[PDB]
Write a protein that binds this ligand. Structure first.
Ligand SMILES: [Mg+2]
Ligand code: NI
Ligand code: NI
Ligand code: NI
Lengths: 155, 145, 155, 155, 145, 145
């Protein structure tokens, strides 16, 4: 039917966005504000849910500007058909803490630095509610029955 | 050739699902003679045959192998013995995994997790029949932190 | 024909597992026991082989519980149609070693710590034979002939 | 029509390569020479452009030999249909710098060490023009219209 | 139900694209009465309806939401006011993203980036109509380093 | 337009595969006149034409470019000269890559790896014809550690 059903789970949720009908993916937005010091990990809530149809998988994955200009690393999540809960973005700040070096500055998702409320390790990121953090790409799948064999054989 | 205790596993399961040897054959496509030999310990069963029994029983095949692993570690299967409780709890657990982010992104193994939830209840003399989805969900998140 | 042929290469091999007909992937099991100190890398044997049919690629990839609660990082392997050898999981422990800190404890694939036979850097993982480490997702592919052009042009 | 259009953007560009008609991907070559000390990042130019047809996405991704025998980490880029610029490989050297340890040696893409012109941190890689760094895998995609719903409902 | 200022956003946009209420309906499939009520502030508009207006106007839907976000932060939309300039600049910006590696791999948000380019021009009293693609491209790379 | 030594590369290869200029045309779809001019150095050959020769010769096209790269580094191609040995060895190497995990996950370039295996044999005066798959496999793993 060529439509994807979407649930907005809160007032902080943003409907996913697309530029161009031909684009591979839908940009996905953080619903919360998160501070990650170096080597810190989190799963970041979007307050969005989707219904991937049978025969597909959803790929929740990174964007070139974010991953090449920051140390934020996103591990591609595989969304099953029928997972209907809150979509989460699986993230690590893979900067390394440098000896001492402490600072009131925090980096953002564009690689820029501003001034924060506290003293932390140099290299800390702060993700904001509304940051355009990831994308969703949906691809078809093959899901066969398994057969054990002693030797492989022609189809 | 798989171990012979698979025969007991399939018989006891067939009985639990309220199916006759003839009715199982109707769904599996084995001969009634083959099924009886399977359960009696006559014929050994193959891995590919276990996949077919699962489909006919309406149980995920991997669960039969997990039961068999219990046979090997001890000499019997507590899960198989109390399969009714496992059924009830496994259903809550699946509903949680596919509907709650805290479970979906943290879970390691739904079967082992079903068993730890039952074992926790048993240790506090609580009956599975007298609790609901929301109680399990709160507990399940506790064991995943 | 909708079946996938599988070879069990040893007594430590486990047949791949699936919950639900609609699930994207098949869970894959380690056939060996491996200790990885921080920043250590390995390709971990499964003792399983598969025959991916022509027109597809197999994706050997991570699971959300493992990658979000441990420092074990899996690099998605691309399995060609016709690769028939032992499937390997490409893994790094991306914890960083903290100064001294040494310990007899080792972390497992659930993020928990137990006591080991030796003294090692704090942050060391131990993977066990039978650990449910990865999944296999199979997707269709386009494999065209290449044409060089001076300028792009409409299809 | 089963052909993929390719533009060679310079004399350092190499036409992508494939062994076997059934292989998942096309090997992709660096057009430049780059030194990456530990934790250093770059997007490495190939001087190649492609025209991915509508309904697909291109995946610019790693090779098993490179990622399992070096610390070079490649983040899979998603190439949109209609992106016609220079293809870039998104790379980090994820070795950690060890205290002092400095050296005139640099590691290559095979994990081997040779002698360089300068003194740098032990763990530095040098990528050379013509290195077989990545591959391109092209998969079909679903690109539906979005519908917001209060509750999910059967298709 | 979306805010009522969406009515103004759709009217002003409809007018900019040189379309009549009847002609928009012909492309959207709404009733002329529905469109008028939408613009007048009678009917509230839904998110799904905004997706349809976008398609009919030949404007990416997300842009309407960004304009609305300007209404909420200030009390009006500079972008909406100078939409002709935004159109011109957004087109250069898109041509750059899909044809130049330095833009494609570094860009964070094409809309915000279009606006920073306009704001830079305004601060140096330069007219968008008197410059070309290559001037914008050089500047755009500057703001992405 | 590609270098003219490609003409020699295609002639010598055509001859090695025991094919006539007429029979190659039958598989490639070039004119016999075109093929002769290609080999003689009359017509320059394009990259797209090299892809077609490869298919007709039953050789992966990239190999022709690698041979040409040998021409450019030295002034001749050792590989082309001893192409029969390269053929034999490249076949072992491919069988190893697609059937053994140690090769599949460690290999960097099958062509360069085929050549290092031949060069090692030559340095120890060993004849490629007098050894088997298992000997090569052991050696190949040695050069990948
Ligand atoms: Mg790291
Ligand atoms: Ni059940
Ligand atoms: Ni526009
Ligand atoms: Ni050959």
């Amino acid at each position: 039917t060529n439509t994807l059903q979407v649930r907005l789970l809160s007032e902080n949720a943003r409907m996913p966005e697309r530029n161009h009908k031909t684009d591979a993916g839908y940009d996905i937005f953080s619903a919360e504000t998160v501070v990650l010091e170096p080597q810190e990990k989190a799963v970041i809530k979007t307050d969005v849910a989707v219904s991937i149809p049978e025969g597909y998988v959803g790929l929740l994955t990174s964007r070139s500007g974010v991953s090449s200009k920051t140390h934020l690393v996103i591990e591609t999540g595989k969304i099953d058909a029928g997972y209907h809960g809150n979509l989460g973005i699986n993230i690590k700040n893979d900067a390394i803490a440098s000896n001492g070096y402490i600072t009131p500055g925090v980096f953002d998702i564009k690689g820029e630095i501003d001034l924060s409320d506290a003293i932390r390790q140099y290299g800390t990121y702060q993700i904001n509610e509304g940051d355009k953090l990831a994308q969703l790409v949906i691809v078809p799948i093959w899901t066969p029955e398994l057969k054990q064999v002693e030797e492989f054989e022609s189809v | 050739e798989l171990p012979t205790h698979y025969g007991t596993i399939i018989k006891t399961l067939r009985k639990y699902m309220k199916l006759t040897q003839s009715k199982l054959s109707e769904r599996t496509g084995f001969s009634q003679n083959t099924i009886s030999n399977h359960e009696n310990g006559n014929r050994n069963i193959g891995v590919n045959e276990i996949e077919i029994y699962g489909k006919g029983l309406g149980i995920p095949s991997y669960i039969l192998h997990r039961i068999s692993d219990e046979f090997k570690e001890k000499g019997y299967s507590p899960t198989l013995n109390d399969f009714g409780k496992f059924d009830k709890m496994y259903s809550y657990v699946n509903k949680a995994y596919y509907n709650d982010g805290d479970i979906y992104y943290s879970s390691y193994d739904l079967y082992d997790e079903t068993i730890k939830l039952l074992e926790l209840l048993k240790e506090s003399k609580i009956n599975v029949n007298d609790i609901d989805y929301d109680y399990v969900l709160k507990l399940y998140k506790q064991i995943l932190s």
